[PDB]
Amino acid sequence: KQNAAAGNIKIVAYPDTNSLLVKGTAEQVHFIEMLVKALDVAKRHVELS
Amino acid sequence: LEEKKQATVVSRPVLLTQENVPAIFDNNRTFYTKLIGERNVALEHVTYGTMIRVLPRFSADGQIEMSLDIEDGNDKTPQSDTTTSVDALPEVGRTLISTIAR
Amino acid sequence: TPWSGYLDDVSAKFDTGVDNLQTQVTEALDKLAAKPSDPALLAAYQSKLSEYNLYRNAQSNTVKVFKDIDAAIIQNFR
Amino acid sequence: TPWSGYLDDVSAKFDTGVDNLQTQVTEALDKLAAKPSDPALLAAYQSKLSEYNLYRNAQSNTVKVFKDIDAAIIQNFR
Amino acid sequence: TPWSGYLDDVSAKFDTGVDNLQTQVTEALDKLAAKPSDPALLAAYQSKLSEYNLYRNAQSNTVKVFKDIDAAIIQNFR
Amino acid sequence: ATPWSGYLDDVSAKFDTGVDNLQTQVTEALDKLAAKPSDPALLAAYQSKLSEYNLYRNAQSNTVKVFKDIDAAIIQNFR
Amino acid sequence: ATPWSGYLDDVSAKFDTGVDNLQTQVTEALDKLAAKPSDPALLAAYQSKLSEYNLYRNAQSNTVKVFKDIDAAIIQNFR
Amino acid sequence: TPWSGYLDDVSAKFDTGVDNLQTQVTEALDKLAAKPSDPALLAAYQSKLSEYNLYRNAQSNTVKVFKDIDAAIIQNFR
Numbered sequence: 371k372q373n374a375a376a377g378n379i380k381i382v383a384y385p386d387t388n389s390l391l392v393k394g395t396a397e398q399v400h401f402i403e404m405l406v407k408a409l410d411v412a413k414r415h416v417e418l419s
Numbered sequence: 420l421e422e423k424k425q426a427t428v429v430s431r432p433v434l435l436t437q438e439n440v441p442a443i444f445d446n447n448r449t450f451y452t453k454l455i456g457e458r459n460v461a462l463e464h465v466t467y468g469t470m471i472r473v474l475p476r477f478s479a480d481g482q483i484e485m486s487l488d489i490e491d492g493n494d495k496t497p498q499s500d501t502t503t504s505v506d507a508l509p510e511v512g513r514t515l516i517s518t519i520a521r
Numbered sequence: 522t523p524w525s526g527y528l529d530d531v532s533a534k535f536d537t538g539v540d541n542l543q544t545q546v547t548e549a550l551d552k553l554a555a556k557p558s559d560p561a562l563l564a565a566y567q568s569k570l571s572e573y574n575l576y577r578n579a580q581s582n583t584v585k586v587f588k589d590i591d592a593a594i595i596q597n598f599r
Numbered sequence: 600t601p602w603s604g605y606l607d608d609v610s611a612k613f614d615t616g617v618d619n620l621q622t623q624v625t626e627a628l629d630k631l632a633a634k635p636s637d638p639a640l641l642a643a644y645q646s647k648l649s650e651y652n653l654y655r656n657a658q659s660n661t662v663k664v665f666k667d668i669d670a671a672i673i674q675n676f677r
Numbered sequence: 678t679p680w681s682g683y684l685d686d687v688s689a690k691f692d693t694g695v696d697n698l699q700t701q702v703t704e705a706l707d708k709l710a711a712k713p714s715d716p717a718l719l720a721a722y723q724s725k726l727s728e729y730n731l732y733r734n735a736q737s738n739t740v741k742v743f744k745d746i747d748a749a750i751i752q753n754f755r
Numbered sequence: 756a757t758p759w760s761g762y763l764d765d766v767s768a769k770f771d772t773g774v775d776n777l778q779t780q781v782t783e784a785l786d787k788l789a790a791k792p793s794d795p796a797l798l799a800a801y802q803s804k805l806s807e808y809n810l811y812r813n814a815q816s817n818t819v820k821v822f823k824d825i826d827a828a829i830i831q832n833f834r
Numbered sequence: 835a836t837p838w839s840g841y842l843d844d845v846s847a848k849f850d851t852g853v854d855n856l857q858t859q860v861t862e863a864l865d866k867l868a869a870k871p872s873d874p875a876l877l878a879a880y881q882s883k884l885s886e887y888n889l890y891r892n893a894q895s896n897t898v899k900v901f902k903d904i905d906a907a908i909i910q911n912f913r
Numbered sequence: 914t915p916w917s918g919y920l921d922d923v924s925a926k927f928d929t930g931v932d933n934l935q936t937q938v939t940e941a942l943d944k945l946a947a948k949p950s951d952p953a954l955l956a957a958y959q960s961k962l963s964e965y966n967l968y969r970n971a972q973s974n975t976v977k978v979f980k981d982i983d984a985a986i987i988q989n990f991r
Contacts, residue, residue: 534706
């Protein structure tokens with residue numbers, strides 16, 4: 371329900387396919403998804419001489 | 420006395436792996452300087468060897484990312500005391516690299 | 522950084538104090554094995570081997586003593 | 600979420616505090632088992648086995664002390 | 678720390694009673710690890726390590742005794 | 756099927772799987788030596804093998820004892 | 835001020851202040867002998883200094899150990 | 914001296930039981946230190962130091978035994 375607690379979410383890493391499993395309510399899943407895509411970005415390359 | 424020397428070595432290993440699966444390739448090999456006779460010097464030799472350790476990742480842009488450990492070189496050999504072999508097998512260094520690239 | 526305890530530090534002090542002994546003691550042997558009858562080679566190798574011996578001994582006994590000082594304190598928590 | 604009390608939180612602080620020791624110990628053991636006579640493997644195993652021993656001791660001594668503090672309070676509800 | 682109990686005080690009496698031994702053993706080790714075969718350095722280090730052992734040990738036994746002296750008193754409040 | 760084995764047995768067995776053949780080599784080296792107990796090529800070999808065997812056994816037993824004491828010291832706190 | 839020094843330090847230093855300068859004398863005798871190893875009077879001189887130095891270091895360290903063992907046995911009875 | 918208990922009495926009976934060993938051992942220590950190679954001085958020291966060791970060990974166990982008897986009786990006042 372819309373008033374479910376933040377502490378109920380569970381996250382399990384699954385490297386076999388480089389993916390994540392998330393358990394919660396629909397709105398929680400949605401927020402988690404937004405945070406994930408706010409976090410991962412393609413790192414720049416640097417060369418040092 | 421005047422002397423000139425030039426040398427060139429190229430080596431290329433190939434390894435097959437699967438996405439997200441770690442893999443390693445390891446090789447060692449020896450070569451013998453054919454300086455020859457019965458009134459000969461002892462047959463000198465040099466040994467070369469390589470490690471690769473890798474973990475590949477597919478990125479949706481059609482890019483491959485790899486975590487890489489590379490070790491390469493040839494075995495330190497004070498025992499190859501000979502002067503007569505100025506035709507030594509070429510002294511490469513010894514090198515370690517670890518990094519990530521995309 | 523890599524995880525290392527206090528015993529690891531006490532141990533690594535010696536390894537970083539003897540800059541290169543671990544290699545020299547090997548190369549000396551490699552040379553000696555080529556011509557065991559050379560007295561200069563024998564003389565060098567003797568000193569190197571002896572230094573490596575003492576290095577390993579001191580390194581081990583010190584680690585033991587710090588293990589005991591720790592265990593004695595841990596015992597008194599209760 | 601698997602329910603966790605307080606005691607298993609205190610206990611877990613040690614587990615995450617020694618990040619990798621648990622595996623470093625077995626790695627060092629498999630090398631030592633591959634060649635018992637190498638002194639460089641021996642002297643590396645000693646430090647890890649000792650660190651492990653001390654870690655486990657401190658862990659359980661602390662858990663016991665807390666359980667005693669809680670039982671002494673619950674005894675006063677009556 | 679800002680707050681300091683009675684057991685804290687009794688512990689700290691040793692730490693201030695040995696002026697800088699905690700440093701003398703560290704730098705004696707730094708010197709010895711650099712030249713493990715010097716008898717003058719080994720003979721110094723043996724003494725400083727032993728003194729450090731007896732200090733750390735008696736500090737802990739004394740704190741244990743004072744804890745039990747008065748854990749036995751607060752048992753009679755009820 | 757196979758007999759039950761504990762953690763201490765897994766530890767003891769690691770060493771034995773590590774030294775693949777030492778247990779046999781130490782026997783055959785002895786029978787070669789004892790057949791002609793005055794050949795320096797046989798003697799130098801046997802010295803090595805016997806030393807290796809000694810260090811192997813002696814390291815195995817000490818490791819098992821240390822793991823025993825760690826466990827007995829944890830179990831002592833259940834009460 | 836002067837660096838702090840325990841009881842064991844003092845029992846040790848009673849030797850370093852008892853043998854007045856042996857630690858210098860040995861290095862002098864070695865620097866002279868290395869100059870000309872074949873002098874009988876130099877070999878005869880060095881043998882004595884080396885032996886005295888050996889004995890001095892033995893008696894020193896054994897005495898420090900004995901006191902450290904007499905102390906630990908009292909400290910253990912505080913509990 | 915101003916105030917002493919029963920345990921203090923038990924202890925003091927050794928400190929006066931041995932008349933002068935407390936000095937003899939320090940005396941012999943520096944006689945030897947002056948000339949650490951004299952066999953007569955070595956033999957003289959070895960026995961005085963052994964007697965000092967046994968004197969301190971015998972003294973301490975007795976005081977502990979009496980402490981445990983008295984604590985056992987006091988436990989039953991309640």
